[PDB]
Design a protein around this ligand. Structure first.
Ligand SMILES: NC(=O)c1cc(F)cc2[nH]c(-c3cc4c(o3)CNCC4)nc12
Length: 346
């Protein structure tokens, strides 16, 4: 006998789905016989990051192949895999290291979700797990102007290059993470506050909601980030929705709208490797060739919502088709909405 609206209950069910957790491990080709979901360890995972860092430093050092193979095997001992016919790829290159690092990040949030679900007896089922997210979740009436702005944002900022799917807003939730208002308070005085997209895999949202958007830990390899270890956002919904990793088998994804206090944006057209920021700068803006039409930006409770159609930016010589935004302090993010999206594939 649960009191939450059904869409909120359906959200709680999808994010605490144990079958989805195991399926994600299977897709990563983890050996579940040797490392079940119930044995995932934050300490083992932390050590796995560190080994990936040693591997990364040894590609760049030009170390012996015996030293590299040995490090790559230590990683596979920490996180056992089952590749069937092929061999476990040697971890001897940036792209192999980044793939295992992105997987470790996903694994950590899966550990957060499952250890939450298995943590500390007369309340309704969906409601006890809802409380573990420490997030107030309310459904946004579809008939509201609130909903109308959000659907125009989604409709107008789908990229032309991301032709593989269309998007339909199923549910719009307004969320308030416990303690995030207070944590965000100092940065509300930063100028240039923007409502931006951040996509992630569904198996990440129990961790995202209970802990907020986080930065990769220092043990993690420095390779693989266009703008270093930070929190990344888009102003084009499909650039973030690509990060849901949804498929035809599971075509439902979750995407966040976060208020991000950008302040004075360090504008860059190519990969730069300071995670440090210049004095007076509070964020990085990667400049894309296409940007939402600035004329159609609107201000909503003092926050810019760039809902315009993508138009040429005039920015030539950039590695980026579309903008992105990075902040390096987790307190610069106040999560506002969680969208349940339907992907209708080609
Ligand atoms: N999630 C997003 O919505 C998103 C939106 C953007 F406009 C740019 C992004 N870049 C990344 C991202 C994730 C990882 C890396 O970059 C580097 N390697 C580790 C994992 N995410 C976004």
């Amino acid at each position: 006998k649960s009191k939450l609206p059904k869409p909120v209950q359906d959200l709680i069910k999808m994010i605490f789905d144990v079958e989805s957790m195991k399926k994600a491990m299977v897709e990563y080709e983890i050996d579940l016989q040797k490392m079940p979901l119930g044995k995932l360890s934050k300490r083992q995972i932390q050590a796995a990051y560190s080994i990936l860092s040693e591997v990364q430093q040894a590609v760049s050092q030009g170390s012996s192949d015996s030293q590299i193979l040995d490090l790559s095997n230590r990683f596979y001992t920490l996180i056992p895999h089952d590749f069937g016919m092929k061999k476990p790829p040697l971890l001897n290159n940036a792209d192999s290291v980044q793939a295992k690092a992105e997987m470790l990040d996903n694994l950590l949030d899966i550990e957060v979700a499952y250890s939450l679900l298995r943590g500390g007896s007369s309340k309704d089922p969906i409601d006890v797990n809802y409380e573990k997210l420490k997030t107030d979740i309310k459904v946004v009436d579809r008939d509201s102007e609130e909903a109308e702005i959000i659907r125009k944002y989604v409709k107008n900022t789908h990229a032309t290059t991301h032709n593989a799917y269309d998007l339909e807003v199923i549910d719009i939730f307004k969320i308030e993470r416990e303690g995030e208002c207070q944590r965000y308070k100092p940065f509300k005085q930063l100028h240039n506050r923007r409502l931006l997209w951040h996509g992630s895999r569904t198996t990440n949202f129990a961790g995202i909601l209970s802990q907020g958007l986080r930065i990769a830990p220092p043990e993690a390899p420095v390779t693989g980030y266009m703008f270093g270890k930070g929190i990344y956002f888009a102003d084009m919904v499909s650039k973030s929705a690509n990060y849901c990793h949804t498929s035809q088998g599971d075509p439902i994804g979750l995407i966040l709208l976060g208020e991000v206090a950008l302040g004075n944006m360090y504008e860059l057209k190519h990969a730069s490797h300071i995670s440090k920021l210049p004095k007076g700068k509070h964020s990085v803006k990667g400049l894309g060739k296409t940007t939402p039409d600035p004329s159609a930006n609107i201000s909503l409770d003092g926050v810019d919502v760039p809902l315009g159609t993508g138009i040429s930016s005039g920015v030539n010589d950039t590695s980026l088709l579309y903008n992105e935004y990075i902040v390096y302090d987790i307190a610069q993010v106040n999560l506002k909405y969680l969208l349940k999206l339907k992907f209708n594939f080609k």
